[PDB]
Design a protein around this ligand. Structure first.
Ligand SMILES: [Cu+2]
Ligand SMILES: [Cu+2]
Ligand SMILES: [Zn+2]
Ligand SMILES: [Zn+2]
Length: 312
């Protein structure tokens, strides 16, 4: 895509929104926004390999590094793709970010879509610490906050054989959903657990944008690259993102087990860097006879969502 976004959150007070824009498909990426809750001074700022936040920032794995090079600073030949250097927080604990980088992309095998942006406790020494740790992390220390990099309203995306989504919302609904596609236009297995739901049927869809800047609202409509009407997963007439219903048991738990051949974890129907949403009400699978049925299945409000990240 030509635009991406990341909401950074952690166990402490660090939070922010970082925007990405890439106008020419392998030109430089503009990176800008704001992070607050930081100590005054320099903080390591990196793309890590996996958009897996199922164990906070730890499950993001190491720096994104397809080239197997040593850690470096940005404007520097020997670096990781994900080495974006340092952000500087002012005396109000705010880092105003304004970067331009040519090594990261929002498309291709060097795409950061569906990966994790991390802000660190300490400064990145940019590989010039002498020791071994410096040539892997820049001695940047703890991961204070992170988020999965999602597709924002523009354009695209990213590529993997496993993906994962951490669902959260305003209310008590939360869960983790796993995606596995062992052959690269075969079915995607979709499995996991969501809790805090009312007993019964809940609409379950991939929405177009991996944008959670305004909660689930900013995820936009159902992912619909073929411009079809909403349907059930078994219908010819459906959105790519229309995975049907999941069922919550009397304890409010939906043990999701789905297999879909229309979604993909690569190519132009890739759901990497898009948002998975679970809904208030049953999806009528486009059989409701009203205009809303043909758009959303009358599934109602978005109880929880998250950005679908590369796991594999
Ligand atoms: Cu990092
Ligand atoms: Cu939906
Ligand atoms: Zn690095
Ligand atoms: Zn739909």
């Amino acid at each position: 895509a030509t635009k991406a976004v990341c909401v950074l959150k952690g166990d402490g007070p660090v939070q922010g929104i970082i925007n990405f824009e890439q106008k020419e498909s392998n030109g430089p990426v503009k990176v800008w926004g704001s992070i607050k809750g930081l100590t005054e001074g320099l903080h390591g700022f990196h793309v890590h390999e996996f958009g897996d936040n199922t164990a906070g920032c730890t499950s993001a794995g190491p720096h994104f590094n397809p080239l197997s090079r040593k850690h470096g600073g940005p404007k520097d030949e020997e670096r990781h793709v994900g080495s974006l250097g340092n952000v500087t927080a002012d005396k109000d604990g705010v880092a105003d970010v304004s970067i331009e980088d040519s090594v990261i992309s929002l498309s291709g095998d060097h795409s950061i879509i569906g990966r994790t942006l991390v802000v660190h406790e300490k400064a990145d020494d940019l590989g010039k610490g002498g020791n071994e740790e410096s040539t892997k992390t820049g001695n940047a220390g703890s991961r204070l906050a992170c988020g999965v990099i999602g597709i924002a309203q523009g354009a695209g995306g990213g590529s993997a054989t496993k993906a994962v989504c951490v669902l959260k919302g305003d209310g008590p609904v939360q869960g983790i959903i796993n995606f596995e596609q062992k052959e690269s236009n075969g079915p995607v297995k979709v499995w996991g657990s969501i809790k805090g739901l009312t007993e019964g049927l809940h609409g379950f869809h991939v929405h177009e944008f991996g944008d959670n800047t305004a909660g689930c609202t900013s995820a936009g409509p159902h992912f619909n690259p073929l411009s079809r009407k909403h349907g059930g997963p078994k219908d010819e007439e459906r959105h790519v993102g229309s995975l049907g219903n999941v069922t919550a048991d009397k304890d409010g738990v939906a043990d999701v087990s789905i297999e879909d051949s229309v979604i993909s974890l690569s190519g132009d129907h890739s759901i990497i860097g898009r948002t998975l949403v679970v809904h208030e009400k049953a999806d009528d699978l486009g059989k409701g006879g009203n205009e809303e049925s043909t758009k959303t299945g009358n599934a109602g409000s978005r109880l929880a969502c998250g950005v679908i990240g590369i796991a594999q």
